[PDB]
Amino acid sequence: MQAKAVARTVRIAPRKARLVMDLIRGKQVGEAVSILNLTPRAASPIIEKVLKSAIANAEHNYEMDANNLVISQAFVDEGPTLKRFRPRAMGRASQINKRTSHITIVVSEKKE
Amino acid sequence: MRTTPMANASTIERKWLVVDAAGKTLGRLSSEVAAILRGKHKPTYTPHVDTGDHVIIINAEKIELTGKKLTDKIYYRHTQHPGGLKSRTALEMRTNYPEKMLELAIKGMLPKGSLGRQMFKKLNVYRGSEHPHEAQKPEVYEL
Amino acid sequence: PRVKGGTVTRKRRKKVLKLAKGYFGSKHTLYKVANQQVMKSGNYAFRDRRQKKRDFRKLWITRINAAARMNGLSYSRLMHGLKLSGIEVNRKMLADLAVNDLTAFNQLADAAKAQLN
Amino acid sequence: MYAIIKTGGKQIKVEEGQTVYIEKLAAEAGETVTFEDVLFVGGDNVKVGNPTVEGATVTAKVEKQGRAKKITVFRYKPKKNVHKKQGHRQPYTKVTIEKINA
Amino acid sequence: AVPFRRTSKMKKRLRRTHFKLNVPGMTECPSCGEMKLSHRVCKACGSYNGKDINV
RNA sequence: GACCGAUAGUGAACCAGUACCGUGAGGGAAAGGUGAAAAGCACCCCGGAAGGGGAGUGAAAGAGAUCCUGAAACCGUGUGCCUACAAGUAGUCAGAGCCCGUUAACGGGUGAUGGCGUGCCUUUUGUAGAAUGAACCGGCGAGUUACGAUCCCGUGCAAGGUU
RNA sequence: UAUCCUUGGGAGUCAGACUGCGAGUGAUAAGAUCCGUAGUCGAAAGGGAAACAGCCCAGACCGCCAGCUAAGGUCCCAAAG
RNA sequence: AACAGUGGUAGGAGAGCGUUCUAAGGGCUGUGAAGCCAGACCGGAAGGACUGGUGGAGCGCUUAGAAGUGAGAAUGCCGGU
């Protein structure tokens, strides 16, 4: 059926993650994971991490096959937004947003 | 009722006819051609879905403006480049490129947005001999 | 004796956004701009009900006039000749019968010419 | 058969064996009405000129009264603030022809 | 000159898309069963004109 | 109590004259909800962790510790239709293809052509503006109450009404 | 009588704006200045004038794929000799 | 029945609708009330109401009287974005 995990509250922009997110969709798990592991990008090991736990959970806990999985679909949405002031010049202040976002992934079997 | 006999989008005419512009006054010829291109000729719907008649001229020769304005009706357009306003007189337009003063003279008499200029392009004209068509065996006609 | 708020206001609002539905994602997701679209759509409707009815005249006659010409006759003397032949216009609308049966329109065109000879 | 009938102040084209949207001139539910105000029979014959053909008389089986859906009417007057709304419902009747008696 | 409109989804998307992130030009190296870096030292068998380092 | 229900009712429902601000008296905020019962997840696995993922709990776990019902703006994912030769406050009217489908009118979905359409208030003679105001959505919010005066109109009495 | 008249209860408006007709100023530069009359716009659509508030046709309380018509046209766009 | 109709800003005049509340005659709801979203849903001129889904404990038709009684506008107001 499906292989599943989710990460909640993860410092990474929706915009930033969105790029990498679409690029792993429909892709063979075995290929996607390997790629991500060594890259100069920092969102790569994070989206990877969650993806690997989806595999992990699927096997160990409710029984699935990890040799049949691909990446069904995935998406990324902003979670809460925590505004913080950063003293901006001219007597002002700006609101930097240290984002905490919900990276969602639905792995699944499709080669079973 | 609330509707009436009308054209469908599967209604295709698109007949090809020989016509000449040689010895023709123009605006007598071009106007009546424009009518048929617009879909008016059919007993069925004129603008919503329509097919006109594509017409190919073989011989395009002398046009009559019946005065001194045959050789002195100066045409104009304003096209992007720093030279702007380019002008070409009737006398020299008749000598070379008489195609394009009969082409824009049936576009000027047609309304229509997108589709109208598409069907229009299938109309051709030439001063020598033009009709490679033989698939539809173009029927002779003169207005 | 204090008004409900919420729900009541959202009932009144829903009407506007429903009439303005199907447009964009800025023309009915935004209330104040949705308002503007409803004004247009309603006005358009009412004027065009009368505009369309006059346009049908300016449509059938265009078709007829061309067909008539392919039987050696012009619209002006067609219409006249029909009234001369029986005291019937027979509807310009219903002369759409030149599509359905060509034969009818042909003989009725000759019948028009008859009293004009 | 090609025929034409009077429906009050207008006329409608009518064949035979087909329903038609008509004005209510009284024609409710399952009844039978006729059009002796018929004025064309042919489509291969002519009956113009001849207002009212007496060689024919259409028979119709009344097939329900329907009602046209509401359609927005509105007056906005910009800079004057008017907001008069209406929706035009109005009933109408439907009949089905199936035999044009001679 | 500064924004005069809120900016619809259509405009914003036309801008931010037509281009998208792509994976590096990694090749699949069947001599270690994982991706390597094309014409660069592999991260699991050292492939780039000799193979001898599996780190 | 013909008082109000988390923007209402006192500045302040709640660990508020607190937080926060100026040298200073002083100015002066926001903030309700897991269950009926805590039984707030025994037991296990992966995530360095942050979290989840099975299982169990219980009526309910889309009640699982940041949670009542939780809209809308806002932002992603899947799907039907549609666009790479064109001219627009985006619809309206009318045809037309494709897809779908109504309990009933027998019906919805879309946009390929043709005609037509220049936001609202502010302010008027005229703003569609190159005049005034608005980032957007939601909720919130301005013709009042009392006592005289003058009319209204409903009734009881009416040469009587009234403490 | 979709007239006046009388009484009681609520008004709103005070550059109107624009055009024609008629009298006066410049014996008639000036979005120059005044009135008698009517019209329209104001406040009220649409038709014709390319569109072009106020000229000209005319007044929108609602659907009809019915017809006649005004100003204004009939070679095409812009229905139609 | 016949007969005529002018429905336009400022305003005048006539009826209704929803919202909260108190009242006396009545009635629904855990097998699903209030609130929430979709329906090619029906009935309105308009202001105005039905079924499925979610949700998980209260709700209301008539007859009357009362109001904090219906927002697209003053770099209006508060939260979200």
Swiss-Prot record, chain A:
Keywords: Ribonucleoprotein, Ribosomal protein, RNA-binding, rRNA-binding
HAMAP family, A to Z: Ribosomal_uL22_B (MF_01331_B)
Organism domain of life: Bacteria
Subunit structure of this chain's protein: Part of the 50S ribosomal subunit.
Protein name in the entry: Large ribosomal subunit protein uL22
Gene Ontology CC, one term: cytosolic large ribosomal subunit
Protein family (similarity comment): Belongs to the universal ribosomal protein uL22 family.
Role of this protein: This protein binds specifically to 23S rRNA; its binding is stimulated by other ribosomal proteins, e.g. L4, L17, and L20. It is important during the early stages of 50S assembly. It makes multiple contacts with different domains of the 23S rRNA in the assembled 50S subunit and ribosome. The globular domain of the protein is located near the polypeptide exit tunnel on the outside of the subunit, while an extended beta-hairpin is found that lines the wall of the exit tunnel in the center of the 70S ribosome.
Gene: rplV
Molecular functions (GO terms): rRNA binding; structural constituent of ribosome
Pfam families xrefs: Ribosomal_L22
Annotated organism of origin: Bacillus subtilis (strain 168)
Record PROSITE patterns: RIBOSOMAL_L22
Record-level GO BP terms: translation
Curated annotation (Swiss-Prot), chain C:
One GO BP: translation
InterPro entries recorded: Ribosomal_bL20, RIBOSOMAL_L20_CS, Ribosomal_protein_bL20_C
CDD domains, per database record: Ribosomal_L20 (cd07026)
Molecular function terms, GO-annotated: rRNA binding; structural constituent of ribosome
Pfam families: Ribosomal_L20
Keywords (A to Z) from UniProt: Ribonucleoprotein, Ribosomal protein, RNA-binding, rRNA-binding
Annotated GO CC locations: cytosolic large ribosomal subunit
Quaternary structure and partners: Part of the 50S ribosomal subunit.
Stated role: Binds directly to 23S ribosomal RNA and is necessary for the in vitro assembly process of the 50S ribosomal subunit. It is not involved in the protein synthesizing functions of that subunit.
Family: Belongs to the bacterial ribosomal protein bL20 family.
Protein name according to UniProt: Large ribosomal subunit protein bL20
UniProtKB/Swiss-Prot annotation, chain D:
Cystine bridges: none
Keywords, ordered alphabetically: Ribonucleoprotein, Ribosomal protein, RNA-binding, rRNA-binding
Domain of life: Bacteria
Chain segments annotated as coiled-coil in the UniProt record: none
GO cellular component: cytoplasm; ribonucleoprotein complex; ribosome
PANTHER family assigned to the protein according to its UniProt record, in alphabetical order: 50S RIBOSOMAL PROTEIN L21 (PTHR21349), LARGE RIBOSOMAL SUBUNIT PROTEIN BL21M (PTHR21349:SF0)
Protein purpose: This protein binds to 23S rRNA in the presence of protein L20.
Name of the protein in question: Large ribosomal subunit protein bL21
Protein species of origin: Bacillus subtilis (strain 168)
Lineage: Bacteria, Bacillati, Bacillota, Bacilli, Bacillales
Gene expressing this chain: rplU
Swiss-Prot record, chain E:
Coiled-coil segments on the chain, per record: none
GO biological process, one term: translation
InterPro entries per the UniProt record, alphabetical: Ribosomal_bL32, Ribosomal_bL32_bact, Ribosomal_zn-bd
Keywords: Ribonucleoprotein, Ribosomal protein
GO cellular component: large ribosomal subunit
SUPFAM superfamilies referenced in this protein's UniProt entry, alphabetically: Zn-binding ribosomal proteins
GO molecular function, one term: structural constituent of ribosome
Family as reported in the entry's similarity comment: Belongs to the bacterial ribosomal protein bL32 family.
Oligomer and partners: Part of the 50S ribosomal subunit.
HAMAP family: Ribosomal_bL32 (MF_00340)
Protein name per the record: Large ribosomal subunit protein bL32
Organism of provenance: Bacillus subtilis (strain 168)
